[PDB]
């Protein structure tokens, strides 16, 4: 993801400005959805949300705009267990042998003969949490095992936190509300307001270790490799408690990175360190933020942001729409000289021709030199000491740079890498003169739409990730909800797109209408004021209600919904229950089948409906996925989560479930491709809690779902 907030000292109008370019999946449980929420007098926010959540996750209001990027802080720790020498199912803490707890979950599996069979699976747990096995790295033998403690399993505040963000007035209010609750699971927050403040916060839920414990409690070999691993045989390595923290064991808000400026702040998934290089952020826990070389996207952004010239909205938009492959700036000059040094090497002629004509872009009409450049860079990354100027901590924005062609060993390996890359490109089936837009597409029914952009690891700010499918590259994730917000006199001016369009259902009018615009890179107004909404010739309006009494006076659930162009709903209600009612109904109209599928996943019922050979939209096998979510979303966990919700959040969720179900009752297939399927059914608030918790652990134990399912104690092997 990318984010840039510009303040009064650098903006062309002297006010705040925000570019939100989150990079997220184009399908599944993290597919963004645009909506505008209003409870007149006290809530008025617009942006995009994630499936099943009745709050705006990235968006803007009258005076404020905010967005998020995945951060580099740890949101869990691994614990290396010391096993009981007498018993591999017991482990030692302060030399005392403790038994592992055993939790069995039962999964129903649809077999080839259509019958259901029951599968029982044991999940072993320690005082820290479940055991995890990565064969060859985190084993469970007779000496050691590994447990995982996820900090967000106890974060019952996540929905309250975004509802609170949705009510924030300006940057200072937003900061207060986030630091007060500490409900953000695993993202940075960047924001700008009309008075020209630009805010960066690494304010998320992070395991807390007092500084004196961190070197003693770490596992050096695992930490050096990138895992937050601690000594689990020592009770002194438990997360530290500080009553200023909102949650037992997490890092107090005052110890997390914050930068409040009036020039700019930026983040492209590196640490807090170089958010703005004029004020580096340093001295934090390694669980929080480290001074690691920035990736090419952030290096690109900083190359465009530094200096003293004022920044216009158009400048930020074109940082996305230029599709510049910034990694080429570092190697392509040296690479093209090697090409000029080896004319008549027939093995390099096509590659060198394509790389020389190339516009250095990932545009629809960029030539095949992009493909040659990608395959080369995949090999260049594996070479040792091939940079002319290696990374230099005192030049962290300008290094590494160039190829060390003057060393004949580097020259030999680089030329071989280019030959191998050329061979791979030509081995694969791609026409002569094919262009990048001819290769990378998003399928919509039986047709394709050409998609610009390229992988973010090549320094394309418009990051697009794709996989080979048949004859093409199918987009699976990247640029998603785009929002560029400025604050002129009359109200917030928001511009952007939802790259993959509002609806995942091929029957919907809003299945590919913004994707056509994304292909052409034509961003649109995001209408927010009543005047803007009223000016839309596509405007449609629906009022819905159901429930208690209903008279001699207004009772029950009620919402007013207006849709503007591209199927963007604007939901007005007098309370949270009515607001949720409108959200659930509108979301179901566009995405009922998606939500039903993701609820099956979060209920651990994939194998029941689809058998063991299928996968979830997260690409986990159905039965391991079911085991994980049956373990994650046990009744006791859901009940405790529900009991911790505020009245307002409970009401939002109750309304959402009722509005979703209202659409299902009335649907006749106009926009719903799965009517009649046994897994498309009425939902409950528990189902929304299952989705919420599934999202909660995406920064923690969820990433280890396969490792949890694989964790079993050794037998009698040598």
Swiss-Prot record:
- Identify which residues the record assigns to the active site: 1 (nucleophile)
The stated induction of this gene product is: Up-regulated under iron starvation conditions.
* Compartment(s): Periplasm
Coiled-coil regions, chain positions: none
Keywords in alphabetical order, please: Hydrolase, Periplasm, Quorum sensing, Signal, Zymogen
Task: Give the disulfide map.
Answer: none
**Main subcellular localisation:** periplasm
Keyword Hydrolase tagged = yes
Look up the EC number in the record and give it.
3.5.1.97
Q: Which SUPFAM superfamilies match?
A: N-terminal nucleophile aminohydrolases (Ntn hydrolases)
Q: Which GO terms describe its molecular function?
A: hydrolase activity, acting on carbon-nitrogen (but not peptide) bonds, in linear amides; identical protein binding; short-chain fatty acyl-CoA dehydrogenase activity
Gene Ontology terms: biological process? antibiotic biosynthetic process; bacterial-type flagellum-dependent swarming motility; pyoverdine biosynthetic process; quorum sensing; response to antibiotic; single-species biofilm formation
Task: Kindly state which reaction or reactions the protein catalyses.
Answer: an N-acyl-L-homoserine lactone + H2O = L-homoserine lactone + a carboxylate
User: Where does it sit, as one GO cellular component term?
Assistant: cytoplasm
In which family does this protein belong, per the annotation?
Answer: Belongs to the peptidase S45 family.
What additional remark is attached to this entry? This step of the maturation process may not be very specific. AHL-mediated signaling mediates quorum sensing in many species of Proteobacteria, regulating hundreds of genes, including many that code for extracellular virulence factors.
Task: Tell me how this protein assembles.
Answer: Heterodimer of an alpha subunit and a beta subunit processed from the same precursor.
Query: Which PANTHER family does this UniProt record tie to the protein?
Result: ACYL-HOMOSERINE LACTONE ACYLASE PVDQ, PEPTIDASE S45 PENICILLIN AMIDASE
What does this gene product do? Catalyzes the deacylation of acyl-homoserine lactone (AHL or acyl-HSL), releasing homoserine lactone (HSL) and the corresponding fatty acid. Possesses a specificity for the degradation of long-chain acyl-HSLs (side chains of 11 to 14 carbons in length). Degrades 3-oxo-C12-HSL, one of the two main AHL signal molecules of P.aeruginosa, and thereby functions as a quorum quencher, inhibiting the las quorum-sensing system. Therefore, may enable P.aeruginosa to modulate its own quorum-sensing-dependent pathogenic potential. Also appears to be required for pyoverdin biosynthesis.
Protein name, UniProt field: Acyl-homoserine lactone acylase PvdQ
State which gene encodes it.
pvdQ
């Amino acid at each position: 993801s990318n984010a840039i907030a510009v303040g009064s000292e650098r903006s062309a109008d002297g006010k705040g400005m925000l570019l939100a370019n989150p990079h997220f999946p184009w399908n599944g449980a993290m597919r963004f959805y645009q909506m505008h929420l209003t409870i007149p007098g006290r809530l008025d926010v617009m942006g995009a949300s994630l499936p099943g959540l009745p709050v705006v996750n990235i968006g803007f209001s009258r005076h404020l705009a905010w967005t998020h990027t995945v951060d580099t802080s740890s949101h869990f720790t691994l614990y290396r267990l010391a096993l009981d020498p007498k018993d591999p199912r017991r482990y030692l803490v302060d030399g005392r042998s403790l038994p592992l707890e055993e939790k069995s979950v039962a999964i129903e599996v649809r077999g080839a003969d259509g019958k259901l069979s029951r599968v029982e699976h044991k999940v072993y747990q320690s005082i820290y949490g479940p055991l995890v096995v990565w064969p060859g790295k985190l084993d469970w033998n007779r000496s050691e095992a590994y447990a995982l403690r996820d900090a967000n399993l106890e974060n019952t505040r996540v929905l309250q936190q975004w509802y609170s963000i949705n009510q924030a007035s300006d940057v200072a209010d937003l900061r207060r509300r986030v630091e007060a609750l500490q409900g953000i699971p695993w993202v940075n927050t960047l924001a700008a307001d009309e008075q020209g403040n630009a805010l960066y916060m690494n304010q998320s839920v992070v395991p807390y270790l007092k500084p004196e414990l961190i070197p003693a409690c770490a596992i050096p070999q695992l930490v050096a490799e990138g895992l937050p691993a601690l000594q689990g045989q020592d009770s002194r390595c438990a997360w530290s408690r500080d009553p200023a923290a909102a949650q037992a064991g997490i890092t107090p808000a005052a110890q997390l990175p914050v930068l409040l400026r009036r020039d700019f702040v930026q983040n492209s998934n590196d640490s807090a360190w170089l958010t703005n290089p004029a004020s580096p952020l340093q001295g934090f826990s390694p669980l929080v933020s480290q001074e690691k070389p920035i990736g090419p996207r952030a290096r690109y952004a900083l190359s465009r942001l530094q200096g003293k010239q004022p920044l216009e909205a158009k400048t930020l938009e074109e940082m996305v729409t230029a599709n510049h492959v910034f990694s080429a700036d570092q190697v392509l000059p040296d690479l093209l000289r090697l090409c000029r040094d080896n004319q008549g090497e027939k093995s390099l002629a096509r590659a060198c021709a394509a790389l020389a004509q190339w516009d250095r872009g990932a545009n629809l009409d960029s030539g095949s030199g992009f493909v040659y450049f990608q395959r080369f860079m995949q090999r260049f990354a594996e070479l040792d000491g091939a940079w002319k100027e290696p990374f230099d901590a005192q030049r962290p924005l300008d290094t590494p740079q160039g190829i060390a062609l003057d060393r004949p060993q580097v020259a030999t390996q680089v030329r071989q890498a280019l030959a191998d890359a050329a061979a791979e490109v030509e081995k694969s089936g791609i026409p002569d003169g094919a262009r990048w837009g001819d290769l990378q597409v998003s399928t919509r029914g039986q047709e394709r739409i050409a998609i610009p952009g390229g992988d973010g690891h090549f320094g394309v700010y418009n990051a697009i990730q794709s996989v080979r499918k048949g004859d093409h590259l199918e987009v699976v994730g990247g640029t998603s909800y785009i929002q560029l917000v400025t604050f002129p006199e009359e109200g917030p001016k928001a511009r952007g797109l939802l790259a993959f369009s509002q609806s995942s259902d091929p029957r919907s009018p809003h299945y590919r209408d913004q994707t056509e615009l994304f292909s052409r890179q034509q961003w649109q107004t995001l209408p927010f004021s009543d005047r803007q909404i009223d000016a839309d010739p596509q405007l449609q309006r629906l009022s819905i209600r159901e429930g208690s009494s209903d008279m001699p006076r207004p009772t029950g659930l009620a919402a007013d919904i207006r849709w503007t162009a591209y199927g963007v709903p604007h939901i007005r209600a007098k309370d949270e229950r009515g607001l949720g009612y409108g959200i659930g109904y509108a979301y179901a109209r566009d995405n009922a089948c998606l939500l039903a599928e993701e609820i099956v996943t979060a209920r651990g019922e994939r194998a029941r409906y689809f058998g063991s050979e299928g996968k979830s939209s997260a690409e986990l096998d159905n039965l391991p996925s079911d085991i994980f979510y049956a373990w994650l979303n046990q009744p006791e966990a859901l009940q405790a989560f529900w009991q911790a919700q505020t009245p307002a959040v409970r009401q939002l969720l109750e309304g959402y479930a009722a509005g979703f179900n209202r659409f299902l009752r009335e649907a006749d297939g106009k926009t719903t491709s799965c009517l009649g399927q046994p897994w498309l059914r009425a939902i409950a608030t528990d189902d929304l809690l299952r989705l919420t918790r599934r999202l909660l652990v995406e920064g923690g134990v969820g990433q280890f779902a396969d490792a949890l399912v694989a964790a079993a104690p050794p037998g009698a092997e040598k």
